[PDB]
Amino acid sequence: GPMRTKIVVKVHMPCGKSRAKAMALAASVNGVDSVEITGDDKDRLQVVGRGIDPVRLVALLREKCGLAELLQVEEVKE
Amino acid sequence: GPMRAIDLSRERDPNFFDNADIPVPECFWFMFKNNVRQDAGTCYSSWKMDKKVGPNWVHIKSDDNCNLSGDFPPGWIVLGKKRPGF
Ligand SMILES: [Cl-]
Ligand SMILES: [Cl-]
């Protein structure tokens, strides 16, 4: 099937309320299939989906959370 | 000694989550700046990823045993190892 991609973004989201806003944003992005929080500090979003533009995703997060940094983009090997 | 300042056999696992809907990635990667661990995660073997490494955005290839290849900025390195069960 179609190429899927894993994207890991560091996001400024110090508490649960801020995490929920970031997760809701990410979940609404066209081609996102899943969103999970990862990291020791719970400040990474792990997103998996189809045809997502990672830079646009980061732009949208940055203008909602105040800081967002792309850490990893990896096609899903399948 | 020690002979190696970076020894992945002595590193704790990354903080990660294997998504249920995609294949489990075979490798752990670990990123160091002047031998101090900065981050860690997962990636596929026999594959590739794009990764932030200090100030740089780097294309990193993996071989069948999680050896990683990329052009890292000075003081930085990303190293791989195969996860147990693979
Ligand atoms: Cl970025
Ligand atoms: Cl997985």
PDB file of C-alpha atoms in Angstrom, chain B:
ATOM      1  CA  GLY B   1      40.561   1.866  30.181  1.00  0.00           C
ATOM      2  CA  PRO B   2      37.821   1.973  29.372  1.00  0.00           C
ATOM      3  CA  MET B   3      38.826   1.459  25.749  1.00  0.00           C
ATOM      4  CA  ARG B   4      35.534   2.944  24.533  1.00  0.00           C
ATOM      5  CA  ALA B   5      34.002   6.144  25.923  1.00  0.00           C
ATOM      6  CA  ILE B   6      30.794   5.239  24.074  1.00  0.00           C
ATOM      7  CA  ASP B   7      29.737   1.659  24.718  1.00  0.00           C
ATOM      8  CA  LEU B   8      26.187   0.919  23.635  1.00  0.00           C
ATOM      9  CA  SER B   9      26.191  -2.355  25.595  1.00  0.00           C
ATOM     10  CA  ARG B  10      26.258  -0.174  28.756  1.00  0.00           C
ATOM     11  CA  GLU B  11      23.561   2.293  27.623  1.00  0.00           C
ATOM     12  CA  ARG B  12      20.022   2.137  29.051  1.00  0.00           C
ATOM     13  CA  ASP B  13      17.295   1.662  26.489  1.00  0.00           C
ATOM     14  CA  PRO B  14      15.709   4.734  24.871  1.00  0.00           C
ATOM     15  CA  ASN B  15      12.368   6.088  26.009  1.00  0.00           C
ATOM     16  CA  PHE B  16      10.156   4.963  23.131  1.00  0.00           C
ATOM     17  CA  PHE B  17       6.875   3.477  22.062  1.00  0.00           C
ATOM     18  CA  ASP B  18       6.374   0.852  19.401  1.00  0.00           C
ATOM     19  CA  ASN B  19       3.261   1.942  17.473  1.00  0.00           C
ATOM     20  CA  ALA B  20       0.866  -0.956  17.108  1.00  0.00           C
ATOM     21  CA  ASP B  21      -0.027  -0.294  13.439  1.00  0.00           C
ATOM     22  CA  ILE B  22       3.484  -0.297  11.872  1.00  0.00           C
ATOM     23  CA  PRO B  23       6.273  -2.915  11.944  1.00  0.00           C
ATOM     24  CA  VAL B  24       8.473  -2.882  15.038  1.00  0.00           C
ATOM     25  CA  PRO B  25      11.751  -1.092  14.258  1.00  0.00           C
ATOM     26  CA  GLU B  26      14.809  -3.321  14.683  1.00  0.00           C
ATOM     27  CA  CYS B  27      17.308  -0.741  15.927  1.00  0.00           C
ATOM     28  CA  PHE B  28      17.959   1.500  18.847  1.00  0.00           C
ATOM     29  CA  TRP B  29      19.873   4.662  18.037  1.00  0.00           C
ATOM     30  CA  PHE B  30      21.768   6.806  20.514  1.00  0.00           C
ATOM     31  CA  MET B  31      23.003  10.359  19.936  1.00  0.00           C
ATOM     32  CA  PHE B  32      26.006  11.819  21.725  1.00  0.00           C
ATOM     33  CA  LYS B  33      27.641  15.257  22.008  1.00  0.00           C
ATOM     34  CA  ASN B  34      31.207  15.054  23.395  1.00  0.00           C
ATOM     35  CA  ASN B  35      30.380  11.512  24.681  1.00  0.00           C
ATOM     36  CA  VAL B  36      27.371  12.759  26.633  1.00  0.00           C
ATOM     37  CA  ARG B  37      24.123  11.103  25.640  1.00  0.00           C
ATOM     38  CA  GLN B  38      21.600  13.668  24.295  1.00  0.00           C
ATOM     39  CA  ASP B  39      18.739  11.560  22.933  1.00  0.00           C
ATOM     40  CA  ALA B  40      17.873   7.990  21.902  1.00  0.00           C
ATOM     41  CA  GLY B  41      15.133   6.274  19.952  1.00  0.00           C
ATOM     42  CA  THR B  42      14.294   3.652  17.365  1.00  0.00           C
ATOM     43  CA  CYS B  43      14.813   3.236  13.643  1.00  0.00           C
ATOM     44  CA  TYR B  44      14.510   0.438  11.050  1.00  0.00           C
ATOM     45  CA  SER B  45      17.425  -1.725   9.944  1.00  0.00           C
ATOM     46  CA  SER B  46      18.374  -1.930   6.247  1.00  0.00           C
ATOM     47  CA  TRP B  47      16.813   1.484   5.886  1.00  0.00           C
ATOM     48  CA  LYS B  48      17.288   5.233   6.386  1.00  0.00           C
ATOM     49  CA  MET B  49      15.989   8.220   8.316  1.00  0.00           C
ATOM     50  CA  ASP B  50      16.382  11.978   8.450  1.00  0.00           C
ATOM     51  CA  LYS B  51      17.483  13.157  11.874  1.00  0.00           C
ATOM     52  CA  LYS B  52      18.230  16.342  13.761  1.00  0.00           C
ATOM     53  CA  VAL B  53      21.810  16.077  15.105  1.00  0.00           C
ATOM     54  CA  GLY B  54      22.733  19.211  17.057  1.00  0.00           C
ATOM     55  CA  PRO B  55      22.225  22.138  14.600  1.00  0.00           C
ATOM     56  CA  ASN B  56      22.146  19.902  11.519  1.00  0.00           C
ATOM     57  CA  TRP B  57      19.542  17.877   9.610  1.00  0.00           C
ATOM     58  CA  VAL B  58      21.199  14.643   8.564  1.00  0.00           C
ATOM     59  CA  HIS B  59      20.289  11.743   6.275  1.00  0.00           C
ATOM     60  CA  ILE B  60      21.299   8.547   8.132  1.00  0.00           C
ATOM     61  CA  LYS B  61      21.398   5.093   6.505  1.00  0.00           C
ATOM     62  CA  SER B  62      21.247   1.834   8.497  1.00  0.00           C
ATOM     63  CA  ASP B  63      22.678  -1.521   7.437  1.00  0.00           C
ATOM     64  CA  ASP B  64      21.241  -4.949   8.249  1.00  0.00           C
ATOM     65  CA  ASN B  65      22.868  -4.876  11.746  1.00  0.00           C
ATOM     66  CA  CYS B  66      21.965  -1.281  12.644  1.00  0.00           C
ATOM     67  CA  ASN B  67      25.322   0.241  11.756  1.00  0.00           C
ATOM     68  CA  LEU B  68      24.505   3.862  10.955  1.00  0.00           C
ATOM     69  CA  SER B  69      26.105   6.056   8.295  1.00  0.00           C
ATOM     70  CA  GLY B  70      25.777   9.888   8.158  1.00  0.00           C
ATOM     71  CA  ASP B  71      27.636  13.208   8.023  1.00  0.00           C
ATOM     72  CA  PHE B  72      27.536  14.441  11.626  1.00  0.00           C
ATOM     73  CA  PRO B  73      28.647  17.873  12.900  1.00  0.00           C
ATOM     74  CA  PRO B  74      31.816  18.023  15.068  1.00  0.00           C
ATOM     75  CA  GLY B  75      31.508  16.479  18.522  1.00  0.00           C
ATOM     76  CA  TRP B  76      28.291  14.660  17.543  1.00  0.00           C
ATOM     77  CA  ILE B  77      27.596  11.057  16.599  1.00  0.00           C
ATOM     78  CA  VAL B  78      24.586   8.775  16.164  1.00  0.00           C
ATOM     79  CA  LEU B  79      25.247   5.066  16.771  1.00  0.00           C
ATOM     80  CA  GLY B  80      22.986   2.103  16.336  1.00  0.00           C
ATOM     81  CA  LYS B  81      22.483  -1.310  17.795  1.00  0.00           C
ATOM     82  CA  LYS B  82      20.076  -4.104  17.131  1.00  0.00           C
ATOM     83  CA  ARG B  83      17.297  -4.625  19.629  1.00  0.00           C
ATOM     84  CA  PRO B  84      16.850  -7.984  21.419  1.00  0.00           C
ATOM     85  CA  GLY B  85      14.545 -10.350  19.591  1.00  0.00           C
ATOM     86  CA  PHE B  86      15.896  -9.477  16.127  1.00  0.00           C
TER      87      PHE B  86
END
